[PDB]
């Protein structure tokens, strides 16, 4: 209703289109009283299509696949911030 992003089950997902590392992404979400999405919360829902390849609260990008020759700790990715709504 007044969620500028994805609304799902009393939660509002605001997309940050600015590419950031996990540590910085986690910070920007906290600085706005929110957190990064939870993998179990989004996998097997319609949000997966929007949030795949974005940061999950654990520090891994959310993926349908559970793979890897990449050091995620050194990468940048987009992110959603989750504030609980209603």
């Amino acid at each position, epitope marked *: 209703e007044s969620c500028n992003g994805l609304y799902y089950q009393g939660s509002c997902y605001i997309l940050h289109s600015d590419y950031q590392m996990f540590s910085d992404a986690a910070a920007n979400c906290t600085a706005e009283s929110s957190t990064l999405p939870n993998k179990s919360d989004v996998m097997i829902t319609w949000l997966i299509d929007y949030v795949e390849d974005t940061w999950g609260s654990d520090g891994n990008p959310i993926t349908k696949t559970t793979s890897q020759d990449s050091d995620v700790s050194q990468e*940048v990715r987009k992110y959603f911030c989750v504030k609980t709504m209603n």
Partner: antibody, heavy 113, light 113 residues
Framework: EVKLVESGGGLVQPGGSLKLSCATS????????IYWVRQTPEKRLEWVAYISNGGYKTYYPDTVKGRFTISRDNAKNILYLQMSRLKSEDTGIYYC??????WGQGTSVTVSS | DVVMTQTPLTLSVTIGQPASISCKSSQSLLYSNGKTYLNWLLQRPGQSPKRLIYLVSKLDSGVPDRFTGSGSGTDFTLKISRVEAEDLGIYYCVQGTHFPYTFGGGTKLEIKR
């Protein structure tokens, strides 16, 4: 087979500029973040320039900020390190590394009058 | 940056003997995803660095079973159970958990014969 090849590197006078090249093949250039790491004569290893996956972000250490700039060429798949205001402590073998997994052969850069 | 201290600086070991190097970070290297990103690189002289061990204990392909990585938070250990002629060079620990990559001082393996 992932392949990285450093280029440029001559002798530079304390103040001059030099532009290095890291030629890549065997992997999708944009999919990977790449570091520029140098080896001093004392043989310690130091990062001097990071460029993110998809090129979105670039980062430098304080010793090198405001004088080192990292460039890129998506057509040719080449990575550039433009350096200037060269100090004598910038001397060493410069590597580009696609993670700690893959290092090029390296290129020699000496700073002396 | 995250400070990495290796000990000792030089290691002088007879062929066929056990050897070990320690590595200490100023900060936990435990990433938020449960994994700890500590790597052990080995650099021969005249060559670019090569990775032997990643994620504390996992060995790269080819690497003999003699090399064994250990540790959890800020305290890490590389063990060579039986030193062989080809193990010579400078061993580095390098941390991947916190940006940027930072290296230890290096530990030169001088073979005794």
């Amino acid at each position: 087979e992932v392949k990285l090849v450093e280029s440029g590197g001559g002798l530079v006078q304390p103040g001059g500029s030099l532009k290095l090249s890291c030629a890549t093949s065997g992997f999708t250039f944009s999919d990977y973040y790449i570091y520029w790491v140098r080896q001093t004569p004392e043989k310690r290893l130091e990062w001097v320039a990071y460029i993110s996956n998809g090129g979105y972000k670039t980062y430098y250490p304080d010793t090198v900020k405001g004088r080192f700039t990292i460039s890129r060429d998506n057509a040719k798949n080449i990575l550039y390190l433009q350096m200037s205001r060269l100090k004598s402590e910038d001397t060493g073998i410069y590597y580009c590394a696609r993670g700690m997994d893959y290092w090029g052969q390296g290129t020699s850069v000496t700073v002396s009058s | 940056d995250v400070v990495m201290t290796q000990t000792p600086l030089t290691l002088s070991v007879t062929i066929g003997q056990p050897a070990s190097i320690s590595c200490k970070s100023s900060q936990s290297l435990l990433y938020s995803n449960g994994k700890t990103y500590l790597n052990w690189l080995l650099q021969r002289p005249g060559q670019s660095p090569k990775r032997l061990i990643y994620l504390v204990s996992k060995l790269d392909s080819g690497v003999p079973d003699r090399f064994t990585g250990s540790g959890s938070g800020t305290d890490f250990t590389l063990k060579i159970s039986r030193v062989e002629a080809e193990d010579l060079g400078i061993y580095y620990c390098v941390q991947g958990t916190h940006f940027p990559y930072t290296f230890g001082g290096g530990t030169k393996l001088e073979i005794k014969r």
